[PDB]
Amino acid sequence: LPPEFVRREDPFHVPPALVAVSERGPVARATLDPFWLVSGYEEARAVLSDPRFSSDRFQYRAGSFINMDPPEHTRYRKLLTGQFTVRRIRELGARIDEIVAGRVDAMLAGGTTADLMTEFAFPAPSLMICELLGVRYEDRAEFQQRASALADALRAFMQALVTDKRANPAGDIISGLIHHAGADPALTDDELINIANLLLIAGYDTTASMLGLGIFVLLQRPAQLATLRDDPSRIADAVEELLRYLSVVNPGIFRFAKEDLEFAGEHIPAGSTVVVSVVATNRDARHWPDPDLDLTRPRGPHLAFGHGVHQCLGQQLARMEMQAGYAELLRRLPNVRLAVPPEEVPLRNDMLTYGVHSLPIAWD
Ligand code: HEM
């Protein structure tokens, strides 16, 4: 909540206030009312899989499972996980390849410069989500217009979509939830709408911010760019390392104590806010001796997608988009470079998810 804990003056450093708090320990009391800040890798994994911590902000919209606990969460989670099938994953991977290639085709057709956010980083994830939800070609413009806005207009869209899927089932996930998931009870229109919007909202800004902040960082770290571009077989490690290092979720992952409890030696009253700082945890020097950006590091676990029963439902889609997107940009925009000085690129401090507002780039 205090801005000291939110603001990141630069993608390369942990916010000084956080560094300060983490010196008092990996689960540390701070003041909002005391809340606790988790900055240790092993302790963050503990809290995120400890059942004494809730995702319900208040207890201590139907189908909005991100703020539910088991067993209500489990119902929805099982249904969505059920519908992330190998067929769906395979078809979405191909669609993602086509999406990223189309946006790069458009950028090359248009000139030798572009704002990467406008032309690539927002379009790619919104189109991905179109394909996931079953939005028809002729409705993407409208979906993109709305998506920018940032219910009830958007809520009206998903209602229409839902009604269309009940009448006319396709292979999308909303169709799957209606017709194929053996749901019982059957999902209401309201639940389907909130699920659809949850997927949009969880996957849009996050994926966009990884795509733009990642290119921003690589543009400033020529040895790292050259590694991604020149060794395409290590795209999977590169993406893990970008996920860990950029830590776009900000100011972190929130939980709320269900009851008075003791954790890592702290005495936390029921209701208290506990926040896992993704960027601090992902640079825990007790776990990564050298936590600097290194795209040659073999893949190991991080917290960028969280952990436990709520860990990112979309993480495989997100990975496929980042793997396909970063590789497509670096392969196809020759000598890609910033078109302004790096210090002039505006970062998103005054918003939740960290990233960039705009990213002017050029190529030959
Ligand atoms: C780089 C991109 C992304 C990042 C960093 C990200 C990160 C996260 C994190 C940290 C959580 C856990 C929140 C918590 O524990 O409270 C989360 C949950 C979630 N993510 Fe993502 N995510 C991304 C992309 C996506 C995509 C593309 C979708 C599309 C389906 C998506 C859907 C979700 C949903 C539905 C949840 C809630 C899961 C539940 O509560 O069971 N995410 N994500």
Residue numbers in the entry: 19 to 50, 54 to 81, 102 to 191, 205 to 418
Quoted from the paper:
In the absence of substrate, Rif16 adopts an open conformation characterized by retraction of the F and G helices, loss of order in the B′ helix, and missing electron density for the B′C and FG loops. A water molecule that is 2.5 Å away from the heme-iron forms the sixth axial ligand of Fe3+. The BB’ loop-B’ helix-B’C loop region, which is known to be important for substrate specificity determination, is significantly longer than those of many P450 enzymes that recognize smaller substrates. The missing electron density of this region in both structures suggests the great structural flexibility.
Recently, comparative analysis of the rifamycin biosynthetic gene clusters of A. mediterranei S699 (an R-B producer) and U32 (an R-SV producer), together with corresponding genetic complementation testing, strongly suggested that the cytochrome P450 enzyme Rif16 is involved in the conversion of R-SV to R-B16. Indeed, we found that R-L was significantly converted into R-B by Rif16 in the presence of seFdx, seFdR, and NADPH (trace xiii, xiv); the structure of the product was confirmed by the identical retention time of the product and the R-B authentic standard, co-elution with R-B in a co-injection experiment (trace xv), and the consistently observed m/z value of 754.3069 ([M-H]¯, calc.754.3069). These results clearly establish that Rif16 is the long-sought R-B synthase of rifamycin biosynthesis. In both of the structures, there was only one typical cytochrome P450 fold existing in an asymmetric unit.
